[PDB]
PDB file of all heavy atoms in Angstrom:
ATOM      1  N   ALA A   1    -181.020  16.141  50.260  1.00 51.06           N
ATOM      2  CA  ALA A   1    -181.615  15.902  48.980  1.00 51.06           C
ATOM      3  C   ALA A   1    -181.499  14.479  48.611  1.00 51.06           C
ATOM      4  O   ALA A   1    -182.375  13.956  48.015  1.00 51.06           O
ATOM      5  CB  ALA A   1    -181.035  16.859  47.915  1.00 51.06           C
ATOM      6  N   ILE A   2    -180.420  13.824  48.992  1.00 52.43           N
ATOM      7  CA  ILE A   2    -180.339  12.415  48.636  1.00 52.43           C
ATOM      8  C   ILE A   2    -181.521  11.609  49.327  1.00 52.43           C
ATOM      9  O   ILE A   2    -182.080  10.863  48.680  1.00 52.43           O
ATOM     10  CB  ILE A   2    -178.984  11.809  48.954  1.00 52.43           C
ATOM     11  CG1 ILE A   2    -177.829  12.563  48.020  1.00 52.43           C
ATOM     12  CG2 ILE A   2    -178.902  10.400  48.803  1.00 52.43           C
ATOM     13  CD1 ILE A   2    -176.431  12.238  48.494  1.00 52.43           C
ATOM     14  N   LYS A   3    -181.708  12.013  50.562  1.00 52.01           N
ATOM     15  CA  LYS A   3    -182.694  11.381  51.374  1.00 52.01           C
ATOM     16  C   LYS A   3    -184.063  11.559  50.738  1.00 52.01           C
ATOM     17  O   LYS A   3    -184.977  10.725  50.597  1.00 52.01           O
ATOM     18  CB  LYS A   3    -182.685  11.638  52.746  1.00 52.01           C
ATOM     19  CG  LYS A   3    -183.786  10.840  53.561  1.00 52.01           C
ATOM     20  CD  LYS A   3    -183.826  11.355  54.991  1.00 52.01           C
ATOM     21  CE  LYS A   3    -184.711  10.472  55.830  1.00 52.01           C
ATOM     22  NZ  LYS A   3    -186.129  10.581  55.438  1.00 52.01           N
ATOM     23  N   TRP A   4    -184.400  12.892  50.406  1.00 52.55           N
ATOM     24  CA  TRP A   4    -185.647  13.247  49.843  1.00 52.55           C
ATOM     25  C   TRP A   4    -186.036  12.610  48.588  1.00 52.55           C
ATOM     26  O   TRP A   4    -187.150  12.232  48.347  1.00 52.55           O
ATOM     27  CB  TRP A   4    -185.629  14.777  49.642  1.00 52.55           C
ATOM     28  CG  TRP A   4    -185.671  15.666  50.809  1.00 52.55           C
ATOM     29  CD1 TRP A   4    -185.916  15.332  52.069  1.00 52.55           C
ATOM     30  CD2 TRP A   4    -185.878  17.056  50.840  1.00 52.55           C
ATOM     31  NE1 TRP A   4    -186.139  16.241  52.972  1.00 52.55           N
ATOM     32  CE2 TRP A   4    -186.006  17.545  52.149  1.00 52.55           C
ATOM     33  CE3 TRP A   4    -185.646  18.183  49.827  1.00 52.55           C
ATOM     34  CZ2 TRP A   4    -186.039  18.850  52.609  1.00 52.55           C
ATOM     35  CZ3 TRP A   4    -185.743  19.380  50.306  1.00 52.55           C
ATOM     36  CH2 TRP A   4    -186.052  19.763  51.572  1.00 52.55           C
ATOM     37  N   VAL A   5    -184.959  12.449  47.708  1.00 52.64           N
ATOM     38  CA  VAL A   5    -185.126  11.658  46.462  1.00 52.64           C
ATOM     39  C   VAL A   5    -185.422  10.164  46.765  1.00 52.64           C
ATOM     40  O   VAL A   5    -186.379   9.572  46.229  1.00 52.64           O
ATOM     41  CB  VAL A   5    -183.949  11.723  45.646  1.00 52.64           C
ATOM     42  CG1 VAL A   5    -184.046  10.926  44.339  1.00 52.64           C
ATOM     43  CG2 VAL A   5    -183.713  13.237  45.016  1.00 52.64           C
ATOM     44  N   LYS A   6    -184.696   9.564  47.656  1.00 52.13           N
ATOM     45  CA  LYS A   6    -184.947   8.184  48.094  1.00 52.13           C
ATOM     46  C   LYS A   6    -186.447   7.975  48.546  1.00 52.13           C
ATOM     47  O   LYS A   6    -187.035   7.120  48.209  1.00 52.13           O
ATOM     48  CB  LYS A   6    -184.033   7.863  49.187  1.00 52.13           C
ATOM     49  CG  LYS A   6    -184.147   6.524  49.776  1.00 52.13           C
ATOM     50  CD  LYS A   6    -183.052   6.213  50.846  1.00 52.13           C
ATOM     51  CE  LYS A   6    -183.224   4.796  51.360  1.00 52.13           C
ATOM     52  NZ  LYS A   6    -182.062   4.532  52.294  1.00 52.13           N
ATOM     53  N   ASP A   7    -186.900   9.046  49.465  1.00 51.97           N
ATOM     54  CA  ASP A   7    -188.208   9.041  49.904  1.00 51.97           C
ATOM     55  C   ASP A   7    -189.238   9.405  48.924  1.00 51.97           C
ATOM     56  O   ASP A   7    -190.453   9.112  49.168  1.00 51.97           O
ATOM     57  CB  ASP A   7    -188.307   9.916  51.098  1.00 51.97           C
ATOM     58  CG  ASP A   7    -187.418   9.575  52.384  1.00 51.97           C
ATOM     59  OD1 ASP A   7    -187.008   8.318  52.413  1.00 51.97           O
ATOM     60  OD2 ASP A   7    -187.219  10.424  53.098  1.00 51.97           O
ATOM     61  N   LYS A   8    -188.867   9.955  47.784  1.00 52.44           N
ATOM     62  CA  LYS A   8    -189.746  10.587  46.883  1.00 52.44           C
ATOM     63  C   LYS A   8    -190.657  11.569  47.534  1.00 52.44           C
ATOM     64  O   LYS A   8    -191.766  11.847  47.129  1.00 52.44           O
ATOM     65  CB  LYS A   8    -190.617   9.478  46.096  1.00 52.44           C
ATOM     66  CG  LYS A   8    -189.848   8.497  45.417  1.00 52.44           C
ATOM     67  CD  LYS A   8    -190.834   7.468  44.717  1.00 52.44           C
ATOM     68  CE  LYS A   8    -189.936   6.223  44.221  1.00 52.44           C
ATOM     69  NZ  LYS A   8    -189.110   6.491  43.040  1.00 52.44           N
ATOM     70  N   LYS A   9    -190.049  12.304  48.559  1.00 53.39           N
ATOM     71  CA  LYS A   9    -190.804  13.462  49.272  1.00 53.39           C
ATOM     72  C   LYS A   9    -189.850  14.459  49.780  1.00 53.39           C
ATOM     73  O   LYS A   9    -188.952  14.115  50.520  1.00 53.39           O
ATOM     74  CB  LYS A   9    -191.479  12.696  50.492  1.00 53.39           C
ATOM     75  CG  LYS A   9    -192.462  13.550  51.075  1.00 53.39           C
ATOM     76  CD  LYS A   9    -193.832  13.726  50.187  1.00 53.39           C
ATOM     77  CE  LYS A   9    -194.471  15.065  50.395  1.00 53.39           C
ATOM     78  NZ  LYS A   9    -195.595  15.316  49.516  1.00 53.39           N
ATOM     79  N   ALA A  10    -190.001  15.687  49.320  1.00 54.95           N
ATOM     80  CA  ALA A  10    -189.136  16.816  49.677  1.00 54.95           C
ATOM     81  C   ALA A  10    -189.781  17.574  50.882  1.00 54.95           C
ATOM     82  O   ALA A  10    -190.728  18.271  50.811  1.00 54.95           O
ATOM     83  CB  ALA A  10    -189.121  17.838  48.499  1.00 54.95           C
ATOM     84  N   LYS A  11    -189.199  17.367  52.048  1.00 52.88           N
ATOM     85  CA  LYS A  11    -189.734  17.755  53.301  1.00 52.88           C
ATOM     86  C   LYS A  11    -189.392  19.149  53.650  1.00 52.88           C
ATOM     87  O   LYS A  11    -188.559  19.452  54.802  1.00 52.88           O
ATOM     88  CB  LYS A  11    -189.322  16.759  54.388  1.00 52.88           C
ATOM     89  CG  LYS A  11    -190.304  16.806  55.642  1.00 52.88           C
ATOM     90  CD  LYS A  11    -190.044  15.556  56.456  1.00 52.88           C
ATOM     91  CE  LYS A  11    -189.985  15.915  57.921  1.00 52.88           C
ATOM     92  NZ  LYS A  11    -188.856  14.878  58.466  1.00 52.88           N
ATOM     93  N   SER A  12    -189.482  20.052  52.705  1.00 52.89           N
ATOM     94  CA  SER A  12    -188.924  21.396  52.932  1.00 52.89           C
ATOM     95  C   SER A  12    -189.918  22.163  53.926  1.00 52.89           C
ATOM     96  O   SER A  12    -191.162  21.874  54.063  1.00 52.89           O
ATOM     97  CB  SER A  12    -188.909  22.279  51.648  1.00 52.89           C
ATOM     98  OG  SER A  12    -188.769  23.565  51.792  1.00 52.89           O
ATOM     99  N   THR A  13    -189.432  23.143  54.743  1.00 57.74           N
ATOM    100  CA  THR A  13    -190.010  24.030  55.580  1.00 57.74           C
ATOM    101  C   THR A  13    -190.431  25.305  55.048  1.00 57.74           C
ATOM    102  O   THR A  13    -191.083  26.235  55.601  1.00 57.74           O
ATOM    103  CB  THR A  13    -189.133  24.260  56.876  1.00 57.74           C
ATOM    104  OG1 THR A  13    -188.037  25.040  56.493  1.00 57.74           O
ATOM    105  CG2 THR A  13    -188.730  22.924  57.533  1.00 57.74           C
ATOM    106  N   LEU A  14    -190.144  25.452  53.753  1.00 57.62           N
ATOM    107  CA  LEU A  14    -190.287  26.846  53.230  1.00 57.62           C
ATOM    108  C   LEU A  14    -191.966  27.148  53.104  1.00 57.62           C
ATOM    109  O   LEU A  14    -192.657  26.331  52.617  1.00 57.62           O
ATOM    110  CB  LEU A  14    -189.681  26.902  51.689  1.00 57.62           C
ATOM    111  CG  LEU A  14    -189.779  28.329  50.995  1.00 57.62           C
ATOM    112  CD1 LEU A  14    -189.017  29.377  51.679  1.00 57.62           C
ATOM    113  CD2 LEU A  14    -189.378  28.199  49.597  1.00 57.62           C
ATOM    114  N   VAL A  15    -192.207  28.343  53.617  1.00 57.66           N
ATOM    115  CA  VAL A  15    -193.688  28.788  53.472  1.00 57.66           C
ATOM    116  C   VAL A  15    -194.163  28.840  52.074  1.00 57.66           C
ATOM    117  O   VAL A  15    -193.436  29.085  51.178  1.00 57.66           O
ATOM    118  CB  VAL A  15    -193.683  30.230  54.071  1.00 57.66           C
ATOM    119  CG1 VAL A  15    -192.855  31.188  53.204  1.00 57.66           C
ATOM    120  CG2 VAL A  15    -195.108  30.731  54.241  1.00 57.66           C
ATOM    121  N   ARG A  16    -195.353  28.504  51.805  1.00 55.12           N
ATOM    122  CA  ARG A  16    -196.094  28.678  50.523  1.00 55.12           C
ATOM    123  C   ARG A  16    -196.792  29.902  50.466  1.00 55.12           C
ATOM    124  O   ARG A  16    -197.758  30.128  51.253  1.00 55.12           O
ATOM    125  CB  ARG A  16    -197.079  27.503  50.328  1.00 55.12           C
ATOM    126  CG  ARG A  16    -196.479  26.121  50.209  1.00 55.12           C
ATOM    127  CD  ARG A  16    -197.530  25.082  49.837  1.00 55.12           C
ATOM    128  NE  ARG A  16    -196.946  23.680  49.676  1.00 55.12           N
ATOM    129  CZ  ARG A  16    -196.771  23.063  48.473  1.00 55.12           C
ATOM    130  NH1 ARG A  16    -197.172  23.788  47.389  1.00 55.12           N
ATOM    131  NH2 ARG A  16    -196.365  21.928  48.450  1.00 55.12           N
ATOM    132  N   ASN A  17    -196.336  30.814  49.550  1.00 54.45           N
ATOM    133  CA  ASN A  17    -197.052  31.956  49.224  1.00 54.45           C
ATOM    134  C   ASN A  17    -196.739  32.380  47.859  1.00 54.45           C
ATOM    135  O   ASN A  17    -196.219  31.562  47.086  1.00 54.45           O
ATOM    136  CB  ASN A  17    -196.696  33.141  50.278  1.00 54.45           C
ATOM    137  CG  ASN A  17    -195.128  33.471  50.189  1.00 54.45           C
ATOM    138  OD1 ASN A  17    -194.515  33.321  49.092  1.00 54.45           O
ATOM    139  ND2 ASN A  17    -194.614  33.786  51.272  1.00 54.45           N
ATOM    140  N   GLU A  18    -197.258  33.625  47.450  1.00 55.23           N
ATOM    141  CA  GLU A  18    -197.101  33.823  46.026  1.00 55.23           C
ATOM    142  C   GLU A  18    -195.580  34.028  45.474  1.00 55.23           C
ATOM    143  O   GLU A  18    -195.346  33.660  44.436  1.00 55.23           O
ATOM    144  CB  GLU A  18    -197.928  35.117  45.615  1.00 55.23           C
ATOM    145  CG  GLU A  18    -199.486  34.915  45.863  1.00 55.23           C
ATOM    146  CD  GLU A  18    -200.220  36.184  45.391  1.00 55.23           C
ATOM    147  OE1 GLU A  18    -200.586  36.062  44.195  1.00 55.23           O
ATOM    148  OE2 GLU A  18    -200.456  37.061  46.211  1.00 55.23           O
ATOM    149  N   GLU A  19    -194.744  34.464  46.337  1.00 53.48           N
ATOM    150  CA  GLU A  19    -193.430  34.525  46.039  1.00 53.48           C
ATOM    151  C   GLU A  19    -192.687  33.312  45.959  1.00 53.48           C
ATOM    152  O   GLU A  19    -191.605  33.038  45.278  1.00 53.48           O
ATOM    153  CB  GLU A  19    -192.665  35.485  46.914  1.00 53.48           C
ATOM    154  CG  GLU A  19    -192.817  35.415  48.415  1.00 53.48           C
ATOM    155  CD  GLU A  19    -192.161  36.408  49.246  1.00 53.48           C
ATOM    156  OE1 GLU A  19    -190.958  36.696  49.083  1.00 53.48           O
ATOM    157  OE2 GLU A  19    -192.863  37.117  50.019  1.00 53.48           O
ATOM    158  N   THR A  20    -193.192  32.184  46.698  1.00 55.03           N
ATOM    159  CA  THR A  20    -192.554  30.883  46.570  1.00 55.03           C
ATOM    160  C   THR A  20    -193.291  29.835  45.839  1.00 55.03           C
ATOM    161  O   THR A  20    -192.969  28.785  45.792  1.00 55.03           O
ATOM    162  CB  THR A  20    -192.287  30.251  48.033  1.00 55.03           C
ATOM    163  OG1 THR A  20    -193.646  29.842  48.542  1.00 55.03           O
ATOM    164  CG2 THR A  20    -191.684  31.196  48.961  1.00 55.03           C
ATOM    165  N   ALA A  21    -194.346  30.481  45.048  1.00 62.04           N
ATOM    166  CA  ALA A  21    -195.139  29.543  44.327  1.00 62.04           C
ATOM    167  C   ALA A  21    -194.423  28.674  43.209  1.00 62.04           C
ATOM    168  O   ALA A  21    -194.677  27.540  42.958  1.00 62.04           O
ATOM    169  CB  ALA A  21    -196.226  30.307  43.501  1.00 62.04           C
ATOM    170  N   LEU A  22    -193.496  29.340  42.575  1.00 61.24           N
ATOM    171  CA  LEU A  22    -192.754  28.802  41.482  1.00 61.24           C
ATOM    172  C   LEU A  22    -191.907  27.629  41.988  1.00 61.24           C
ATOM    173  O   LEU A  22    -191.928  26.508  41.414  1.00 61.24           O
ATOM    174  CB  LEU A  22    -191.782  29.819  40.712  1.00 61.24           C
ATOM    175  CG  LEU A  22    -190.932  29.140  39.604  1.00 61.24           C
ATOM    176  CD1 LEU A  22    -191.785  28.306  38.681  1.00 61.24           C
ATOM    177  CD2 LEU A  22    -190.219  30.185  38.817  1.00 61.24           C
ATOM    178  N   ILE A  23    -191.098  27.829  43.016  1.00 63.39           N
ATOM    179  CA  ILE A  23    -190.252  26.704  43.553  1.00 63.39           C
ATOM    180  C   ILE A  23    -191.078  25.535  43.928  1.00 63.39           C
ATOM    181  O   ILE A  23    -190.681  24.361  43.729  1.00 63.39           O
ATOM    182  CB  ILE A  23    -189.100  27.190  44.587  1.00 63.39           C
ATOM    183  CG1 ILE A  23    -188.168  26.149  44.882  1.00 63.39           C
ATOM    184  CG2 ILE A  23    -189.914  27.534  45.934  1.00 63.39           C
ATOM    185  CD1 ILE A  23    -187.109  26.091  43.872  1.00 63.39           C
ATOM    186  N   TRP A  24    -192.185  25.746  44.782  1.00 64.46           N
ATOM    187  CA  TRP A  24    -193.012  24.826  45.135  1.00 64.46           C
ATOM    188  C   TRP A  24    -193.618  23.984  43.980  1.00 64.46           C
ATOM    189  O   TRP A  24    -193.814  22.801  44.068  1.00 64.46           O
ATOM    190  CB  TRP A  24    -194.148  25.354  46.044  1.00 64.46           C
ATOM    191  CG  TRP A  24    -193.682  25.283  47.549  1.00 64.46           C
ATOM    192  CD1 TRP A  24    -193.348  26.347  48.444  1.00 64.46           C
ATOM    193  CD2 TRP A  24    -193.287  24.165  48.367  1.00 64.46           C
ATOM    194  NE1 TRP A  24    -193.011  25.980  49.691  1.00 64.46           N
ATOM    195  CE2 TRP A  24    -192.966  24.585  49.691  1.00 64.46           C
ATOM    196  CE3 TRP A  24    -193.381  22.746  48.107  1.00 64.46           C
ATOM    197  CZ2 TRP A  24    -192.554  23.696  50.611  1.00 64.46           C
ATOM    198  CZ3 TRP A  24    -192.991  21.810  49.079  1.00 64.46           C
ATOM    199  CH2 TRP A  24    -192.583  22.360  50.432  1.00 64.46           C
ATOM    200  N   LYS A  25    -194.042  24.785  42.945  1.00 62.92           N
ATOM    201  CA  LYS A  25    -194.581  24.044  41.757  1.00 62.92           C
ATOM    202  C   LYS A  25    -193.538  23.072  41.160  1.00 62.92           C
ATOM    203  O   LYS A  25    -193.843  21.955  40.877  1.00 62.92           O
ATOM    204  CB  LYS A  25    -194.914  25.058  40.729  1.00 62.92           C
ATOM    205  CG  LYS A  25    -195.597  24.413  39.484  1.00 62.92           C
ATOM    206  CD  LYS A  25    -196.449  25.460  38.747  1.00 62.92           C
ATOM    207  CE  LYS A  25    -197.086  24.812  37.590  1.00 62.92           C
ATOM    208  NZ  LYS A  25    -196.187  24.432  36.473  1.00 62.92           N
ATOM    209  N   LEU A  26    -192.251  23.549  41.151  1.00 62.38           N
ATOM    210  CA  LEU A  26    -191.199  22.677  40.525  1.00 62.38           C
ATOM    211  C   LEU A  26    -191.009  21.562  41.464  1.00 62.38           C
ATOM    212  O   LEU A  26    -190.696  20.354  41.036  1.00 62.38           O
ATOM    213  CB  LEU A  26    -189.923  23.480  40.345  1.00 62.38           C
ATOM    214  CG  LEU A  26    -190.147  24.612  39.345  1.00 62.38           C
ATOM    215  CD1 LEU A  26    -188.968  25.525  39.287  1.00 62.38           C
ATOM    216  CD2 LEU A  26    -190.378  24.097  37.985  1.00 62.38           C
ATOM    217  N   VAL A  27    -190.903  21.752  42.827  1.00 58.50           N
ATOM    218  CA  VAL A  27    -190.673  20.610  43.742  1.00 58.50           C
ATOM    219  C   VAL A  27    -191.788  19.674  43.643  1.00 58.50           C
ATOM    220  O   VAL A  27    -191.643  18.421  43.661  1.00 58.50           O
ATOM    221  CB  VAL A  27    -190.505  21.261  45.178  1.00 58.50           C
ATOM    222  CG1 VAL A  27    -190.649  20.136  46.203  1.00 58.50           C
ATOM    223  CG2 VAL A  27    -189.048  21.964  45.109  1.00 58.50           C
ATOM    224  N   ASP A  28    -193.022  20.213  43.697  1.00 57.79           N
ATOM    225  CA  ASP A  28    -194.269  19.168  43.551  1.00 57.79           C
ATOM    226  C   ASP A  28    -194.130  18.437  42.285  1.00 57.79           C
ATOM    227  O   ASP A  28    -194.466  17.219  42.311  1.00 57.79           O
ATOM    228  CB  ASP A  28    -195.550  20.031  43.575  1.00 57.79           C
ATOM    229  CG  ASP A  28    -195.832  20.775  44.906  1.00 57.79           C
ATOM    230  OD1 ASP A  28    -195.101  20.328  45.912  1.00 57.79           O
ATOM    231  OD2 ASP A  28    -196.607  21.588  45.153  1.00 57.79           O
ATOM    232  N   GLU A  29    -193.689  19.144  41.240  1.00 55.35           N
ATOM    233  CA  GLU A  29    -193.717  18.359  39.879  1.00 55.35           C
ATOM    234  C   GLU A  29    -192.570  17.318  39.821  1.00 55.35           C
ATOM    235  O   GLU A  29    -192.692  16.287  39.061  1.00 55.35           O
ATOM    236  CB  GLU A  29    -193.639  19.338  38.759  1.00 55.35           C
ATOM    237  CG  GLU A  29    -194.943  20.115  38.468  1.00 55.35           C
ATOM    238  CD  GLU A  29    -194.811  21.123  37.490  1.00 55.35           C
ATOM    239  OE1 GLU A  29    -193.699  21.576  37.179  1.00 55.35           O
ATOM    240  OE2 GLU A  29    -195.861  21.741  37.220  1.00 55.35           O
ATOM    241  N   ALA A  30    -191.525  17.536  40.594  1.00 54.23           N
ATOM    242  CA  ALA A  30    -190.345  16.623  40.593  1.00 54.23           C
ATOM    243  C   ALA A  30    -190.733  15.421  41.384  1.00 54.23           C
ATOM    244  O   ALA A  30    -190.438  14.371  41.049  1.00 54.23           O
ATOM    245  CB  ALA A  30    -189.246  17.297  41.327  1.00 54.23           C
ATOM    246  N   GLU A  31    -191.311  15.731  42.607  1.00 58.79           N
ATOM    247  CA  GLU A  31    -191.906  14.523  43.315  1.00 58.79           C
ATOM    248  C   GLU A  31    -192.880  13.712  42.460  1.00 58.79           C
ATOM    249  O   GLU A  31    -192.803  12.474  42.448  1.00 58.79           O
ATOM    250  CB  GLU A  31    -192.675  15.066  44.530  1.00 58.79           C
ATOM    251  CG  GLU A  31    -191.934  15.620  45.632  1.00 58.79           C
ATOM    252  CD  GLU A  31    -192.775  16.075  46.749  1.00 58.79           C
ATOM    253  OE1 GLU A  31    -194.064  16.066  46.508  1.00 58.79           O
ATOM    254  OE2 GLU A  31    -192.202  16.405  47.878  1.00 58.79           O
ATOM    255  N   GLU A  32    -193.745  14.369  41.681  1.00 64.28           N
ATOM    256  CA  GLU A  32    -194.700  13.685  40.854  1.00 64.28           C
ATOM    257  C   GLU A  32    -193.886  12.746  39.812  1.00 64.28           C
ATOM    258  O   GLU A  32    -194.349  11.628  39.513  1.00 64.28           O
ATOM    259  CB  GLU A  32    -195.740  14.669  40.207  1.00 64.28           C
ATOM    260  CG  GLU A  32    -196.660  13.986  39.374  1.00 64.28           C
ATOM    261  CD  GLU A  32    -197.653  13.127  40.089  1.00 64.28           C
ATOM    262  OE1 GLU A  32    -197.715  13.195  41.330  1.00 64.28           O
ATOM    263  OE2 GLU A  32    -198.239  12.311  39.441  1.00 64.28           O
ATOM    264  N   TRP A  33    -192.929  13.337  39.225  1.00 65.54           N
ATOM    265  CA  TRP A  33    -192.195  12.515  38.242  1.00 65.54           C
ATOM    266  C   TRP A  33    -191.566  11.371  38.964  1.00 65.54           C
ATOM    267  O   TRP A  33    -191.603  10.283  38.439  1.00 65.54           O
ATOM    268  CB  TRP A  33    -191.053  13.432  37.703  1.00 65.54           C
ATOM    269  CG  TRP A  33    -190.347  12.682  36.532  1.00 65.54           C
ATOM    270  CD1 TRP A  33    -190.684  12.747  35.325  1.00 65.54           C
ATOM    271  CD2 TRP A  33    -189.153  11.873  36.637  1.00 65.54           C
ATOM    272  NE1 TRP A  33    -189.809  11.938  34.442  1.00 65.54           N
ATOM    273  CE2 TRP A  33    -188.963  11.380  35.406  1.00 65.54           C
ATOM    274  CE3 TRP A  33    -188.386  11.416  37.762  1.00 65.54           C
ATOM    275  CZ2 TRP A  33    -187.909  10.411  35.088  1.00 65.54           C
ATOM    276  CZ3 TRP A  33    -187.426  10.557  37.350  1.00 65.54           C
ATOM    277  CH2 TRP A  33    -187.147  10.022  36.096  1.00 65.54           C
ATOM    278  N   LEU A  34    -190.939  11.553  40.237  1.00 64.83           N
ATOM    279  CA  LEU A  34    -190.478  10.426  40.762  1.00 64.83           C
ATOM    280  C   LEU A  34    -191.480   9.260  41.150  1.00 64.83           C
ATOM    281  O   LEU A  34    -191.197   8.016  41.042  1.00 64.83           O
ATOM    282  CB  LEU A  34    -189.797  10.783  42.110  1.00 64.83           C
ATOM    283  CG  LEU A  34    -188.580  11.696  42.191  1.00 64.83           C
ATOM    284  CD1 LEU A  34    -188.192  12.148  43.505  1.00 64.83           C
ATOM    285  CD2 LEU A  34    -187.438  10.844  41.627  1.00 64.83           C
ATOM    286  N   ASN A  35    -192.748   9.680  41.343  1.00 67.54           N
ATOM    287  CA  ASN A  35    -193.797   8.659  41.783  1.00 67.54           C
ATOM    288  C   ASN A  35    -194.459   8.047  40.371  1.00 67.54           C
ATOM    289  O   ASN A  35    -195.318   7.177  40.557  1.00 67.54           O
ATOM    290  CB  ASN A  35    -194.897   9.469  42.464  1.00 67.54           C
ATOM    291  CG  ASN A  35    -194.387   9.655  43.858  1.00 67.54           C
ATOM    292  OD1 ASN A  35    -193.842   8.765  44.516  1.00 67.54           O
ATOM    293  ND2 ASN A  35    -194.943  10.726  44.530  1.00 67.54           N
ATOM    294  N   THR A  36    -194.094   8.407  39.280  1.00 64.65           N
ATOM    295  CA  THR A  36    -194.438   7.960  38.031  1.00 64.65           C
ATOM    296  C   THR A  36    -193.514   7.424  37.078  1.00 64.65           C
ATOM    297  O   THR A  36    -193.849   7.013  35.987  1.00 64.65           O
ATOM    298  CB  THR A  36    -195.447   9.027  37.316  1.00 64.65           C
ATOM    299  OG1 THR A  36    -194.590  10.281  37.058  1.00 64.65           O
ATOM    300  CG2 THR A  36    -196.731   9.401  37.976  1.00 64.65           C
ATOM    301  N   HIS A  37    -192.308   7.385  37.498  1.00 65.54           N
ATOM    302  CA  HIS A  37    -191.204   6.897  36.677  1.00 65.54           C
ATOM    303  C   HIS A  37    -190.317   5.883  37.540  1.00 65.54           C
ATOM    304  O   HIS A  37    -190.277   5.894  38.825  1.00 65.54           O
ATOM    305  CB  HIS A  37    -190.347   8.039  35.999  1.00 65.54           C
ATOM    306  CG  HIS A  37    -191.270   8.779  35.117  1.00 65.54           C
ATOM    307  ND1 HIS A  37    -192.076   9.734  35.542  1.00 65.54           N
ATOM    308  CD2 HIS A  37    -191.428   8.775  33.744  1.00 65.54           C
ATOM    309  CE1 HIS A  37    -192.696  10.264  34.647  1.00 65.54           C
ATOM    310  NE2 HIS A  37    -192.366   9.630  33.459  1.00 65.54           N
ATOM    311  N   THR A  38    -189.386   5.263  36.767  1.00 65.00           N
ATOM    312  CA  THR A  38    -188.538   4.194  37.481  1.00 65.00           C
ATOM    313  C   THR A  38    -187.084   4.533  36.967  1.00 65.00           C
ATOM    314  O   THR A  38    -186.902   5.151  35.854  1.00 65.00           O
ATOM    315  CB  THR A  38    -188.923   2.795  37.045  1.00 65.00           C
ATOM    316  OG1 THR A  38    -188.661   2.570  35.788  1.00 65.00           O
ATOM    317  CG2 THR A  38    -190.309   2.477  37.562  1.00 65.00           C
ATOM    318  N   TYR A  39    -186.075   4.137  37.756  1.00 65.51           N
ATOM    319  CA  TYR A  39    -184.712   4.424  37.378  1.00 65.51           C
ATOM    320  C   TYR A  39    -183.907   3.381  38.254  1.00 65.51           C
ATOM    321  O   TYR A  39    -184.310   3.008  39.367  1.00 65.51           O
ATOM    322  CB  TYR A  39    -184.349   5.849  37.601  1.00 65.51           C
ATOM    323  CG  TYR A  39    -184.489   6.303  39.029  1.00 65.51           C
ATOM    324  CD1 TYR A  39    -183.293   6.055  39.944  1.00 65.51           C
ATOM    325  CD2 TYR A  39    -185.506   6.988  39.621  1.00 65.51           C
ATOM    326  CE1 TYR A  39    -183.359   6.479  41.269  1.00 65.51           C
ATOM    327  CE2 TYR A  39    -185.616   7.417  40.940  1.00 65.51           C
ATOM    328  CZ  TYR A  39    -184.399   7.214  41.734  1.00 65.51           C
ATOM    329  OH  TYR A  39    -184.412   7.567  43.059  1.00 65.51           O
ATOM    330  N   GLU A  40    -182.708   3.012  37.682  1.00 63.99           N
ATOM    331  CA  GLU A  40    -181.687   2.454  38.524  1.00 63.99           C
ATOM    332  C   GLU A  40    -180.516   3.273  38.854  1.00 63.99           C
ATOM    333  O   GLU A  40    -179.655   2.758  39.612  1.00 63.99           O
ATOM    334  CB  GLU A  40    -181.257   1.088  37.726  1.00 63.99           C
ATOM    335  CG  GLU A  40    -182.382   0.090  37.492  1.00 63.99           C
ATOM    336  CD  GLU A  40    -182.008  -1.087  36.662  1.00 63.99           C
ATOM    337  OE1 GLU A  40    -180.824  -1.606  36.833  1.00 63.99           O
ATOM    338  OE2 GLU A  40    -182.731  -1.428  35.720  1.00 63.99           O
TER     339      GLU A  40
END
């Protein structure tokens, strides 16, 4: 996860379907936050 945050990209292998929709939405939105904000 440290690397994924550094990369601003979560390279999960989890299938996308209706039962994983929620987690993928949150992961997608976390990436989007990383790509639109700055931090030290």
